[PDB]
Design a protein around this ligand. Structure first.
Ligand SMILES: CNc1ccccc1C(=O)O[C@H]1[C@@H](O)[C@H](n2cnc3c(=O)[nH]c(N)nc32)O[C@@H]1COP(=O)(O)OP(=O)(O)OP(=O)(O)O
Ligand SMILES: CNc1ccccc1C(=O)O[C@H]1[C@@H](O)[C@H](n2cnc3c(=O)[nH]c(N)nc32)O[C@@H]1COP(=O)(O)OP(=O)(O)OP(=O)(O)O
Ligand SMILES: [Mn+2]
Ligand SMILES: [Mn+2]
Ligand SMILES: [Mn+2]
Lengths: 216, 216
């Protein structure tokens, strides 16, 4: 009986770290590599503005604790919208819509998620009592998802979509949700958007950028 | 009988994904943040040069299989040196020296590892037949190592050192190991170092940087 409550603890943690399907895949003995092509997924990057500056007022341990509190809020939100959190690179938080079950409304869900996230972040304050500014940028396109390496692995996504969302985040103005022109073309029918214009993005040149404002 | 076999695969997967002690800490009902202070550790960042362009000549999933091959070789090299692999995120590979057990020779061991890694990578070729260039950066200092957020728990390490180790990689010239002055002072007695000079790093200002050339 205690064998099955430790198995329960173990299965719950395993389910927490990998998507069910990927976990099932690893539990088989398939020496084959996990690498799946997906035609159309949407990817969002969120990054706190001017984080290393908080190194003056907060200790490193209180900065990790702040991260854990804030990402607990966002995590609660990816469960609410039922989207896929991939990873966290220190200050960035990555959410993907369309993996591993693709859905046709991925672009809309990641749009709603983005807006919902924004309000929530506006509501939080950093450990020193100041607001938490976010740069957010999203994108859509083809992606490869899978697992690399033998230990310390996770489910990761790579692709053209993650590159141009990355650029939408790095080049965003604070507190705004930047979308590229192809996702604007996809979103203009249910969301309100305001043009930002031409921007230079590394590896892609210059493209049109729009701001996500709210629902129609 | 099958409910101890499934449990054996499940615990085994959990074994490879997390440090043992962290697995149990996550399985307990501790409401406390998993954040352990470590005094002196060194962090290495490696990133492949011009990886996105290879999508022209190789299909995306074959690149995942290559990635998995290259980073598998590196995982072997960290067992050889007895260091701590943290993660591989897209193109990036982070190794830590000094956790969980600190060693007086942590910076020397991560220096030898950087060099051994550069030789193994110089010997390898991409699926298209071209070389694989790396950008490498190292740093040492105090680190908070742990798990943040409520879904997709990953054992990660944070701090000033990881910040400047990333800046040392992203700002490096290809095929070189950029280290800042605080590590140059540490290594200069057993390694050969060549000054690159003063460069601007976000969140740190301007720092004098050195290249690790080889063992004395
Ligand atoms: C003293 N610095 C810290 C103390 C405790 C915890 C974290 C840090 C810290 O420096 O985190 C930074 C990265 O090391 C840390 N970190 C970043 N990427 C990674 C990563 O990939 N892995 C790990 N383990 N840590 C990472 O994120 C932080 C922000 O880096 P940004 O590039 O986002 O700069 P910024 O200050 O936000 O201004 P801007 O981004 O708006 O331009
Ligand atoms: C269409 N491109 C691909 C096809 C198949 C598999 C991977 C890719 C691919 O683009 O991988 C990159 C990200 O999509 C993907 N990526 C995945 N997650 C992330 C992420 O979280 N942040 C960023 N910036 N990139 C990510 O892994 C790679 C990160 O690449 P870099 O930004 O380092 O570009 P580079 O070519 O090495 O240029 P440079 O090093 O000389 O500057
Ligand atoms: Mn930031
Ligand atoms: Mn960041
Ligand atoms: Mn990268």
């Amino acid at each position: 009986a205690v064998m099955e409550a430790e198995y329960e603890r173990s299965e719950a943690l395993l389910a927490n770290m990998l998507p069910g399907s990927i976990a099932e895949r690893l539990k088989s003995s398939s020496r084959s590599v996990i690498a799946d092509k997906y035609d159309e997924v949407s990817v969002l990057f969120a990054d706190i503005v001017g984080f290393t500056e908080r190194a003056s007022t907060t200790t490193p341990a209180d900065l990790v604790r702040f991260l854990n509190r804030l990402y607990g809020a966002f995590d609660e939100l990816v469960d609410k919208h039922g989207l896929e959190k991939i990873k966290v690179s220190g200050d960035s938080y990555m959410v993907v819509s369309g993996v591993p079950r693709a859905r046709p409304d991925h672009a809309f869900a990641l749009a709603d998620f983005a807006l919902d996230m924004a309000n929530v972040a506006a509501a939080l304050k950093d450990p020193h009592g100041d607001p938490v500014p976010l740069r957010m940028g999203m994108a859509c396109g083809p992606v490869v998802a899978g697992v690399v390496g033998s230990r310390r692995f996770f489910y990761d996504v790579w692709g053209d979509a993650v590159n141009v969302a990355s650029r939408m985040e790095s080049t965003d103005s604070v507190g705004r949700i930047q979308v590229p022109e192809a996702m604007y073309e996809r979103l203009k029918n249910e969301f309100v958007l305001q043009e930002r214009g031409r921007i230079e993005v590394k590896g892609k040149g210059v493209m049109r950028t729009w701001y996500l404002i709210g629902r129609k």
